[PDB]
Amino acid sequence: ATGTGKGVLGDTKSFTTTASGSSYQLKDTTRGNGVVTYTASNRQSIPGTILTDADNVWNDPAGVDAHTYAAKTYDYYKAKFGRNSIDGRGLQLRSTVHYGSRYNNAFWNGSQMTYGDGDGSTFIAFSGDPDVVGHELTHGVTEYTSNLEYYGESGALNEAFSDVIGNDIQRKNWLVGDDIYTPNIAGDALRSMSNPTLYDQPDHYSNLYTGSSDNGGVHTNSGIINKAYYLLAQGGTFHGVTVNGIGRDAAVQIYYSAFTNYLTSSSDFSNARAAVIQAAKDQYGANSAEATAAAKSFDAVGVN
Numbered sequence: 001a002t003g004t005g006k007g008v009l010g011d012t013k014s015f016t017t018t019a020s021g022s023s024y025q026l027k028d029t030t031r032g033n034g035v036v037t038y039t040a041s042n043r044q045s046i047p048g049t050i051l052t053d054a055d056n057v058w059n060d061p062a063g064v065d066a067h068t069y070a071a072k073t074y075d076y077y078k079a080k081f082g083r084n085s086i087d088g089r090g091l092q093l094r095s096t097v098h099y100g101s102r103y104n105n106a107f108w109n110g111s112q113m114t115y116g117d118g119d120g121s122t123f124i125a126f127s128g129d130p131d132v133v134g135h136e137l138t139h140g141v142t143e144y145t146s147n148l149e150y151y152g153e154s155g156a157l158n159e160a161f162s163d164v165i166g167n168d169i170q171r172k173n174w175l176v177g178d179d180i181y182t183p184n185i186a187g188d189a190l191r192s193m194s195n196p197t198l199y200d201q202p203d204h205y206s207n208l209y210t211g212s213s214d215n216g217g218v219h220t221n222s223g224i225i226n227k228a229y230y231l232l233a234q235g236g237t238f239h240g241v242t243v244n245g246i247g248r249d250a251a252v253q254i255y256y257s258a259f260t261n262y263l264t265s266s267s268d269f270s271n272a273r274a275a276v277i278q279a280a281k282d283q284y285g286a287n288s289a290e291a292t293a294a295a296k297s298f299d300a301v302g303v304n
């Protein structure tokens with residue numbers, strides 16, 4: 001069926017649903033084994049119950065965005081990388097919205113994506129930025145490919161890859177989480193890829209977080225890798241090293257290959273340098289502009 005309704009930002013959009021007797025479920029059976037979207041009804045059981053509406057015009061901004069952006073992320077992965085869902089084999093894409101009460105996170109749990117509402121102050125509903133939905137679904141792709149451990153450098157690569165892909169889906173700017181962060185302040189963001197230190201993440205390896213919080217700083221140290229990606233895609237001069245940019249289209253293909261074909265669950269930043277250089281070489285040639293740019297980008301952020 002064709003359902004319609006507003007996302008978290010108030011924008012009307014359509015999406016596929018299923019008619020069940022007298023009403024409609026937020027379930028699209030036309031993409032792999034499905035895209036299906038649930039409410040946890042402000043408690044913490046997941047998946048919860050499948051969202052329903054009587055007339056197929058939806059009034060649940062969180063669910064409309066979680067569903068629509070899962071479907072858009074499905075299509076982006078098949079169009080851009082030839083991958084069929086998270087496992088490459090059409091794994092059903094399940095999302096739960098209204099997890100808990102004023103809950104300020106979102107997460108991938110090894111099976112589905114889950115989205116809090118936010119407290120209304122720091123965050124609004126998390127499904128409202130396509131680059132957050134991207135970020136969550138990409139943790140799933142990671143699990144099925146490199147299977148990067150969730151601690152120290154490995155866990156930071158895990159997060160940077162989710163930021164790279166989430167951001168690349170929307171391509172609005174170099175920000176992560178900007179649609180859902182601090183509703184009362186325009187222009188800010190949860191993270192910046194172009195300028196990570198703006199949001200207290202390091203952008204150079206000499207400033208690596210070495211404490212034990214946050215699984216050894218997996219959401220902090222990802223800023224190094226995000227900076228490397230940005231320098232490869234955009235170009236720039238940083239710590240004296242000039243990187244000639246190669247554009248997002250080329251950079252994301254190199255990253256996608258590096259993180260899904262070359263990295264393993266124990267990879268550290270140094271292995272990521274090598275995977276990125278290797279993918280650059282596969283795709284463009286050992287001595288190409290792109291393979292040189294892949295090297296400089298890691299030089300510039302101090303990952304040797």
Ligand SMILES: CC(C)C[C@H](NP(=O)(O)O[C@@H]1O[C@@H](C)[C@H](O)[C@@H](O)[C@H]1O)C(=O)N[C@@H](Cc1c[nH]c2ccccc12)C(=O)O
Nearest residue numbers: 104105106107108126132135136139150159177190218219
């Ligand atoms: C895309 C972003 C909107 C959500 C994103 N959640 P994500 O990284 O998928 O998931 C989180 O981290 C993983 C490593 C754990 O496995 C998960 O259980 C979850 O804790 C994140 O960057 N979370 C950060 C930032 C953050 C979110 N809410 C916050 C509230 C306060 C401080 C920081 C935060 C974090 O948990 O740190």
Ligand SMILES: [Ca+2]
Nearest residue numbers: 053055057058
């Ligand atoms: Ca309705």
Ligand SMILES: [Ca+2]
Nearest residue numbers: 129131178179
């Ligand atoms: Ca965004």
Ligand SMILES: [Ca+2]
Nearest residue numbers: 181182183185
């Ligand atoms: Ca804001």
Ligand code: NA
Nearest residue numbers: 108109110111
């Ligand atoms: Na799990």
Ligand SMILES: [Zn+2]
Nearest residue numbers: 135139159162
């Ligand atoms: Zn994450």
